[PDB]
Amino acid sequence: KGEELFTGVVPILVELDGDVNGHKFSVSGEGEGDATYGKLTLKFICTTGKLPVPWPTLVTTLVQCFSRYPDHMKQHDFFKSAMPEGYVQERTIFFKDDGNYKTRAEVKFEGDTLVNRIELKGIDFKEDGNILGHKLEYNYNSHNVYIMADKQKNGIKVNFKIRHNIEDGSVQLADHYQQNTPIGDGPVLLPDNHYLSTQSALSKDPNEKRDHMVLLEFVTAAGIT
């Protein structure tokens, strides 16, 4: 049922409103996903002016239904199974020795288009830490995203560690704790334990003068053979 919605190229819309230490901002993104290849291509624009946090810190917040699940793992793909009604995705992201983001998003189809609508709230950030101080490099590392069933909520629980390169050569860790629960009442796939292997490339549109991020991302499910 849900998986059939992902056999081809799907348009994606992302809309985020944020407030980090009282700095309010909005981000809009557009692009497309091709789950057959685990592939996402998107361009994000800060629609309120200058983004008050580094772009890389928003990548995880800004559609894991575009992950490539190998055929032998298709019974473990919660994300697609919740479609088209969708799922709620909630996180706390702990920036080591700094503040935290808490996010809530709804991921679902509107017509033909896969939409990610997010509210983000950041608190306890240091004024001249790596986030508010803009000390993170404009790049992105490759990670493993660990997934387990959460049967009482008919959903999944997800944990991983994001590594952000700091401009001095060091690393800013961002520990992610995540919960996804279906919006609809229908059956979903509750998975055995497994992970997603991720890679992401960040770039700039040379003709774009707005504060923005171009993202190319590949993600593949693994850990069950």
CA distance linking residue 218 with residue 199, whole number of Å: 5
Task: Say which experimental method was used.
Answer: X-ray
Q: What's the reported resolution, in angstroms, to a tenth?
A: 1.5
Domains contained in the chain, number: 1
DSSP lists the bridge partners of residue 185 as: none
Q: Which of 39, 40, 22 is nearest to 30 (CA)?
A: 40
Assigned token pair, 104: 């809530």
Report the alpha-carbon distance of residue 93 to residue 175 in Å, rounded: 5
Owner of token pair 């860790």 = 173
Rg (CA), the chain: 17
The boundaries of the domain holding residue 86 are 1-225
Task: Tell me which amino acid residue 108 is.
Answer: K
Element spanning 79, H or E: helix 78-81
DSSP annotation string for 91-123: EEEEETTS-EEEEEEEEEEETTEEEEEEEEEEE
87-95 and 171-182 strand pairing: antiparallel
Which CATH number does the domain housing residue 212 bear?
A: 2.40.155.10
Residue with tokens 């950041």: 122
138 in Cβ contact with 51 (< 8 Å): no
Instruction: Return d(Cα 90, Cα 61) in angstroms, integer.
Output: 9
